[PDB]
Design an enzyme around this catalytic site. Structure first.
Site, PDB file in Angstrom:
ATOM      1  N   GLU A 170       0.844  -1.217   0.000  1.00  0.00           N
ATOM      2  CA  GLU A 170       0.000   0.000   0.000  1.00  0.00           C
ATOM      3  C   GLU A 170       0.863   1.245   0.000  1.00  0.00           C
ATOM      4  O   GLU A 170       0.505   2.238  -0.698  1.00  0.00           O
ATOM      5  CB  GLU A 170      -0.919   0.015   1.214  1.00  0.00           C
ATOM      6  CG  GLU A 170      -1.954   1.174   1.131  1.00  0.00           C
ATOM      7  CD  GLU A 170      -2.776   1.332   2.378  1.00  0.00           C
ATOM      8  OE1 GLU A 170      -2.938   2.505   2.796  1.00  0.00           O
ATOM      9  OE2 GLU A 170      -3.282   0.358   2.904  1.00  0.00           O
ATOM     10  N   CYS A 228      -8.720   3.438   8.027  1.00  0.00           N
ATOM     11  CA  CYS A 228     -10.070   3.130   7.542  1.00  0.00           C
ATOM     12  C   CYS A 228     -10.924   2.720   8.708  1.00  0.00           C
ATOM     13  O   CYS A 228     -10.459   2.473   9.818  1.00  0.00           O
ATOM     14  CB  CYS A 228     -10.137   2.067   6.443  1.00  0.00           C
ATOM     15  SG  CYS A 228      -9.728   0.486   7.117  1.00  0.00           S
ATOM     16  N   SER A 283      -0.564  -6.182   7.697  1.00  0.00           N
ATOM     17  CA  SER A 283      -0.321  -5.018   8.486  1.00  0.00           C
ATOM     18  C   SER A 283      -1.404  -4.882   9.556  1.00  0.00           C
ATOM     19  O   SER A 283      -1.080  -4.732  10.732  1.00  0.00           O
ATOM     20  CB  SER A 283      -0.305  -3.763   7.541  1.00  0.00           C
ATOM     21  OG  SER A 283      -0.254  -2.538   8.326  1.00  0.00           O
TER      22      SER A 283
HETATM   23  C1  LIG Z   1      -6.581  -3.744   5.356  1.00  0.00           C
HETATM   24  C2  LIG Z   1      -6.235  -3.866   3.849  1.00  0.00           C
HETATM   25  C3  LIG Z   1      -6.443  -4.969   3.243  1.00  0.00           C
HETATM   26  C4  LIG Z   1      -6.969  -5.977   4.085  1.00  0.00           C
HETATM   27  O1  LIG Z   1      -5.913  -6.434   4.782  1.00  0.00           O
HETATM   28  P1  LIG Z   1      -4.645  -7.154   4.314  1.00  0.00           P
HETATM   29  O2  LIG Z   1      -4.745  -7.716   2.915  1.00  0.00           O
HETATM   30  O3  LIG Z   1      -4.248  -8.005   5.572  1.00  0.00           O
HETATM   31  O4  LIG Z   1      -3.567  -6.010   4.096  1.00  0.00           O
HETATM   32  P2  LIG Z   1      -2.684  -5.101   5.065  1.00  0.00           P
HETATM   33  O5  LIG Z   1      -3.312  -4.889   6.354  1.00  0.00           O
HETATM   34  O6  LIG Z   1      -1.283  -5.740   5.099  1.00  0.00           O
HETATM   35  O7  LIG Z   1      -2.712  -3.762   4.377  1.00  0.00           O
HETATM   36  C5  LIG Z   1      -5.819  -2.807   2.824  1.00  0.00           C
HETATM   37  F1  LIG Z   1      -6.243  -3.310   1.566  1.00  0.00           F
HETATM   38  S1  SF4 Z   2      -8.753  -2.611   5.878  1.00  0.00           S
HETATM   39 FE1  SF4 Z   2      -9.884  -0.736   5.187  1.00  0.00          FE
HETATM   40  S2  SF4 Z   2      -8.767   0.219   3.426  1.00  0.00           S
HETATM   41 FE2  SF4 Z   2      -8.019  -1.925   3.742  1.00  0.00          FE
HETATM   42  S3  SF4 Z   2      -9.301  -3.281   2.352  1.00  0.00           S
HETATM   43 FE3  SF4 Z   2     -10.273  -3.226   4.367  1.00  0.00          FE
HETATM   44  S4  SF4 Z   2     -11.861  -1.513   4.381  1.00  0.00           S
HETATM   45 FE4  SF4 Z   2     -10.351  -1.179   2.622  1.00  0.00          FE
END
Ligand SMILES: C/C(=C\COP(=O)(O)OP(=O)(O)O)CF
Ligand code: SF4
Length: 309
Positions: free
Chosen positions: A126, A197, A226
């Site tokens: 990201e 978010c 993350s």
């Molecule tokens: C929270 C997020 C995606 C959902 O989570 P993950 O694919 O675990 O990604 P991350 O938290 O590593 O950004 C951002 F796309």
């Molecule tokens: S954690 Fe938040 S920004 Fe990341 S995919 Fe999910 S709703 Fe979208």
């Protein structure tokens, strides 16, 4: 042993969308469907999709001409998107709408040649996609991770400065970095609070309440998620042993020996079936009915693109 479940926990709307995008592309077009980067950071989700004919790559040069390519929920840089565009590819974009929101602001600042600072973790996809929306050499795009990074940054024109954040950060650590940015750069412009978010904020708020009751917290999520790492860290900070685990197999019985209350939550990319397997395994180890905690409602759904119904 009492088993408590955090609420909210598990899939957020961006994840559920990004997986449905790949699943639907597979159903419409057949295997292979290429995906740039793990579609979400969950081993169970990625291995499933691979077994159904998704191929996960890091670079567009790993994708053959004529192929369907999906960008992952984490987003991609303009350079990646342009490289896909300049190739043969049918592209669908699974970037989460709430990451795309941040990308649009970084693009706005770049067109202005005004400098921008992203708060985030170096090397995360990201952060690469978001730092990758800035191209104007006349300004600049800087990354900071901590107050100490803010304390060493110098910029060209501190009068025309703005910040953004990664969507999955610790709400509390980010608040510290922002207080440092405003002390160092009093004219800096940002969102009201940050670009974290709703699902990140709500799962942190929920893991805080869970940790208040549970001696041990299990966070279902992969090592490279993350947001899932932030839930474990939050519980650890409250003095609770907390483990980040992919599945019920990972549970060591020492972790829950003579523990009277174990809490379970899951990151935003972890499927509920993993939570149900984890609960079944704690029950084999002495736990009773899993009790869900009362939690803030989430009601947002992001639909797949119409091309992918
Ligand atoms: C929270 C997020 C995606 C959902 O989570 P993950 O694919 O675990 O990604 P991350 O938290 O590593 O950004 C951002 F796309
Ligand atoms: S954690 Fe938040 S920004 Fe990341 S995919 Fe999910 S709703 Fe979208």
């Amino acid at each position: 042993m009492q088993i408590l479940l955090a609420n909210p926990r598990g899939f957020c709307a961006g994840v559920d969308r990004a997986i449905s995008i790949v699943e639907n592309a597979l159903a419409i077009y057949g295997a292979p469907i290429y995906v740039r980067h793990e579609v979400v950071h969950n081993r169970y989700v990625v291995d499933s999709l691979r077994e159904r004919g998704a191929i996960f790559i890091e670079q567009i040069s790993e994708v053959p001409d004529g192929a369907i390519l999906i960008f992952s929920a984490h987003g991609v840089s303009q350079a990646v998107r342009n490289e896909a565009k300049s190739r043969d590819l049918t592209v669908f974009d699974a970037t989460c709408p709430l990451v795309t929101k941040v990308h649009m602001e970084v693009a706005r600042a770049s067109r202005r040649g005004e400098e921008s600072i992203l708060i985030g973790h170096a090397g995360h996809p990201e952060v690469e996609g978001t730092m990758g929306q800035y191209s104007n050499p006349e300004g600049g795009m800087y990354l900071v991770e901590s107050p100490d990074d803010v304390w060493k940054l110098t910029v060209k024109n501190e009068e025309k400065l703005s910040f953004m954040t990664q969507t999955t950060l610790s709400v509390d650590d980010t608040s510290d970095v922002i207080d440092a940015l405003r002390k160092r750069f009093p004219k800096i412009v940002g969102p009201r609070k940050d670009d974290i978010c709703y699902a990140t904020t709500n799962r942190q708020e929920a893991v805080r309440a869970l940790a208040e009751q549970a001696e041990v917290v299990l966070v279902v999520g992969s090592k490279n998620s993350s947001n899932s790492n932030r839930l474990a860290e939050l519980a650890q900070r409250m003095g609770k042993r907390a483990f980040l685990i992919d599945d019920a197999k990972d549970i060591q019985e020492e972790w829950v020996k003579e523990v009277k209350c174990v809490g379970v939550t899951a990151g935003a990319s972890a499927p509920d079936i993993l939570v149900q397997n984890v609960v079944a395994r704690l029950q084999q180890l002495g736990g009773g009915e899993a009790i869900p905690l009362e939690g803030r409602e989430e009601n947002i759904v992001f639909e797949v693109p119409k091309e992918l119904r």
